[PDB]
Amino acid sequence: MYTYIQNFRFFAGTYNVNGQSPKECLRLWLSNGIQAPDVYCVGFQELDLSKEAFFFHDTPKEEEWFKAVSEGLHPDAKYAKVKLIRLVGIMLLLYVKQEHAAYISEVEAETVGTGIMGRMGNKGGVAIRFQFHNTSICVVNSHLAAHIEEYERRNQDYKDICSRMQFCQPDPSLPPLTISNHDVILWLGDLNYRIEELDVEKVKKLIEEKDFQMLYAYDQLKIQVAAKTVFEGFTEGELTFQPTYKYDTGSDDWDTSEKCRAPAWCDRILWKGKNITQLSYQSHMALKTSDHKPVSSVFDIGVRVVAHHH
Amino acid sequence: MYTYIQNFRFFAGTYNVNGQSPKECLRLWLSNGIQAPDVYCVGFQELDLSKEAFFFHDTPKEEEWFKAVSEGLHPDAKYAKVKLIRLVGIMLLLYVKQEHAAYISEVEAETVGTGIMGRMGNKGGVAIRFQFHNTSICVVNSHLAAHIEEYERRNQDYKDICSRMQFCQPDPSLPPLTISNHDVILWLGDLNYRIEELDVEKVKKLIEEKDFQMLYAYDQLKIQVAAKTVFEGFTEGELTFQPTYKYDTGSDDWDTSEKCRAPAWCDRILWKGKNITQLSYQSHMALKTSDHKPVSSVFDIGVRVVAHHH
Amino acid sequence: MYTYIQNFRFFAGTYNVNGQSPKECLRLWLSNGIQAPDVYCVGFQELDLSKEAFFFHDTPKEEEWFKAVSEGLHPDAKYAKVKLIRLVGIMLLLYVKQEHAAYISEVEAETVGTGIMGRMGNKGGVAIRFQFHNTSICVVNSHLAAHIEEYERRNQDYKDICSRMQFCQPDPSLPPLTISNHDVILWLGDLNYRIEELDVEKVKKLIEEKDFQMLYAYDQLKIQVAAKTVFEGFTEGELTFQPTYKYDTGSDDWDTSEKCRAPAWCDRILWKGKNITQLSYQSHMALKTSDHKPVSSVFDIGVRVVAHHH
Ligand SMILES: CCCCCCCC(=O)OC[C@H](COP(=O)(O)O[C@@H]1[C@@H](O)[C@@H](O)[C@@H](OP(=O)(O)O)[C@@H](OP(=O)(O)O)[C@H]1O)OC(=O)CCCCCCC
Ligand SMILES: CCCCCCCC(=O)OC[C@H](COP(=O)(O)O[C@@H]1[C@@H](O)[C@@H](O)[C@@H](OP(=O)(O)O)[C@@H](OP(=O)(O)O)[C@H]1O)OC(=O)CCCCCCC
Ligand SMILES: CCCCCCCC(=O)OC[C@H](COP(=O)(O)O[C@@H]1[C@@H](O)[C@@H](O)[C@@H](OP(=O)(O)O)[C@@H](OP(=O)(O)O)[C@H]1O)OC(=O)CCCCCCC
Ligand SMILES: [Cl-]
Ligand SMILES: [Cl-]
Ligand SMILES: [Cl-]
Ligand SMILES: [Mg+2]
Ligand SMILES: [Mg+2]
Ligand SMILES: [Mg+2]
Secondary structure (H helix, E strand, O other): OEEEEEEEEEEEEEEEOOOOOOOOOOHHHOOOOOOOEEEEEEHHHHHHHHHHHHHOOOOOHHHHHHHHHHOOOOOOEEEEEEEEEOOOEEEEEEEHHHHHHHHEEEEEEEEEEHHHHOOOOOOOOEEEEEEOOOOEEEEEEEOOOHHHHHHHHHHHHHHHHHOOOOOOOOOOEEEEEOOOOEEEEEEEEEEEOOOOOOOOHHHHHHHHHOOOOHHHHHHHHHHHHHHHOOOOEEOOOOOOOOEOEEEEOOOOOOOOOOOHHHHHHOEEEEEOOOOOOEEEEEEEEOOOOOOOOOOEOOOOOOOOEEOOOO | EEEEEEEEEEEEEHHHHHOOOOOOOOHHOOOOOOOOEEEEEEEEOOOOOOOOHOOOOOOOOHHHHHHHHHHHOOOOOOOOEEOOOOOOOOOEEOOOEHHHHHHHEEEEEEEEOOOOOHHHOOOOOEEEEEEEOOOEEEEEEEEOOOOOOHHHHHHHHHHHHHHOEEEEEOOOOOOOOOOOOOOEEEEEEOOOOOOOOOHHHHHHHHHHHHHHHHHHOOOOOHHHHOOOOOOOOOEEOOOOOOOOEOOOOOOEEEEEOOOOOOOEEEEEEEEEEEEEEEEEEEEEEOOOOOOOOOEEEEEEEEEEEEEEEO | OOOEEEEEEEEEEEEOOOOOOOOOOOHHHHHHOOOOOOEEHHHHHOOOOOHHHHHOOOOOHHHHHHHHHHOOOOOOHHHHEEEEEEEOOOOEEEEEEEHHHEEEEEEEEEEEEEOOOEEEEEOOOEEEEEEEEOOEEEEEEEOOOOOOHHHHHHHHHHHHHHHOOOOOOOOOOOOOOOOOOOEEEEEEEEEEOEOOOOOOOHHOOOOOOHHHHHHHHHEEHHHHOOOOOOOOOEEEOOOOOOOEEOOOOOOOOOOOOOOOOOEEEOOEEEEEEEEEEEEEEEEEEOOOOOOOEEEEEEEHHHHHOOOOOO
């Protein structure tokens, strides 16, 4: 046989929904004046903050948010649901255009809890891997540890997801599939990295001034990546939108509670692999259900397709 | 339109069943020579003491006790089940005569755990609110902290149920419904308040002498209400029955175990609202399944009914 | 009526499966060149090591292992499933030849958790009791505390299972059925008792030399039974097979990890009652799914049968 590169459009989204049910149309996030994606990868954090969900019970929030996402996908294409995976509040959805569904194979989904006692699901990661035509793809959604001072724990959460996440494989003989053994890796989530050094007022001033380049110089994810403690070999696109945390629910105002939290680029998307081009990377201010704003990126990704023989 | 007051009969019952399945006919509690209630409000504590129930799993005890209650309702009327709500061992049931069912609306049920780590369901409250004709009603069933020395925690459990219990409402714009925003509030449960100061032998002697007025002078709920720490604006009827805890299972004898627990009026019913009259308040000694006896009260409650226009 | 003793063949098996799904045919354990048993008693430990199973959720491992066992039963007889009981990873299955099913009655199953905080199901026991013809039988499967130094906790786990395990009974009037109130008791499990005194190299040398009599002189279960701290009145057959823990998964090699665990006869079967004869007691090295090997015993057991009147 013979293969060739054919480009497909992948949408990746991440949204921390603060334990809320969906109240708004999600088109403003998932299909806001874009061309129809070929593949949708849609991730949530904090789907359900209840004690019942924490102890691994089913939750109506799973179906509520799945339906909201399905209804918010681009109207020009029929999308097939390929896979849903959830650990407590961390949920990842994979859809493809119906016409591409026949070329999806080897779908596997797994989860890793890195929260209470290092194991519970209040924080951690979920992942879906699959083959699209002849290209292997893994999408990871992680919610890493909270608070500015806990960057070392965020680094450890990342390392633990990478080492513990193992996928099934057709051949029991080879070692299990890990996240890294894929042609294309998309990593999204509330990575929860904050702004070092600067005080809250200075952070807010830089944002008002739209000096995102200066603010980004103090971003913990940037610093840790530069120190090679996390996300080795991954790329992140330039941040041209304002921090996505923390807002008063129902508004675009920064947290006016007593805690008065410093804004942060909590919500991020990164990638690794050949033939990837990021076409956009943005937040969606119009959605106010949560104290975070959703983030999205659209990629053109080259996929190995088998040429038809005649 | 025009409204007028029409009286309906409400039965309220509370029973701590010590993790047991039902073994006796519940008519002796629920329909023991009384007129048929229009509305039944039936609450349990300790429905299931298992670790599985504690971690929020379904339990066969829910259906066993629901059926026992349904079978024990007054035989002269067909009762419609309006709502069931359970948190671990705390369950509340609401029924109305079939003929009144069409005038029930806006039924909402919620729970608040105030047990382990302040959040688990070994203690706490559940509630059902609804509109009957044009009158709003909230029924609360609480199981508050154990032991004579923990009255401050019982006070805190009450305050926490009051502040955390929020109900849905037709209009997202107004603040959520709380327990206090109702025309009629009925609060029942194992409130777990004990007798201060007196030693066990003195308590038992007063009960033998049927001097309930003297024993009540040392009741913690009375004292805390007088200090305005709990149940502000609520009324409780005079206690004319002997303490309902703690008995040897299968008997009317006081706890003969090594612990030799002091008797207490653990199990109580209180109310708040206009046009309420208590017609009775009693315990039911004949039921011996548990180490508590069940308590009941019947009220005449004035309800706002729309007058028919012709 | 008149009764007489008739002998039936009972198979008992215990297998700690290290949280794995079944990968091998279980005939090598359950029907490896033996006559068809009349009754199968098949016990597992560590069916599922997940946090979800630990908090008492259903697991697909239950059905996977039940089907594997059913498929591995002796092919000459149709076996009826009488009962399945599971607590977290501890599962016991009871089957009988179809032709004997009509003579099984009073089947009851219960569990006792003796793990975290003395109550959780990471360790403990499950049991099935029943009447076969006119003889009462109780089969217990226990997973007792780990590690050489914790023999006192293993003793306590045993005592706690014995005192807490209570079965339902036709007559509410008599005291509940306990394990000890049965004509025949079969106790199996990962009892987790280790070899005292000897160092790892010496243990391995004795095993190489096949000097099981000398190694057994240092076995903790033997010592504790002799001290009358556990298993009073029970018998165990001579151990003529090598220790069943701890192996590298997929091999017959001893644990080559850093921990380098000493081999132990973790997995045991004991009995108590009249008219019992052990016909075999062995391990099954050929099964390599787990870090333990399965153990089996076949008994001839005299059962009281009602003579037919003509
Ligand atoms: C081994 C099993 C037994 C263990 C039982 C222990 C139960 C328990 O303590 O969980 C605690 C867990 C903690 O949240 P965690 O994931 O750090 O995530 C939150 C962060 O995302 C931030 O947003 C912080 O809030 P903000 O930045 O202030 O907005 C932070 O709040 P705080 O600063 O207050 O830490 C925290 O709540 O909360 C939950 O997951 C909620 C549901 C479980 C609770 C029920 C059980 C009691
Ligand atoms: C964050 C998650 C992890 C937390 C795990 C922690 C698990 C745990 O310790 O729970 C303990 C919980 C305690 O009972 P709690 O509600 O005070 O209610 C009981 C009172 O109503 C009284 O009747 C007292 O008994 P009496 O007056 O003497 O009759 C009292 O007994 P004690 O005096 O002995 O305190 C107590 O049992 O018991 C239960 O709810 C039973 C079921 C859960 C246990 C399984 C988990 C191990
Ligand atoms: C009151 C409720 C809240 C309590 C939450 C606490 C959760 C928790 O710490 O559990 C711990 C529990 C411990 O295993 P436990 O039964 O001793 O059994 C194992 C033994 O059988 C041996 O094989 C030992 O391993 P090896 O001989 O080395 O092979 C030993 O390992 P270690 O030597 O390392 O002790 C141990 O894992 O592990 C589990 O059961 C696993 C699943 C639950 C964990 C999820 C919750 C975080
Ligand atoms: Cl927007
Ligand atoms: Cl009575
Ligand atoms: Cl073998
Ligand atoms: Mg939140
Ligand atoms: Mg009790
Ligand atoms: Mg193991």
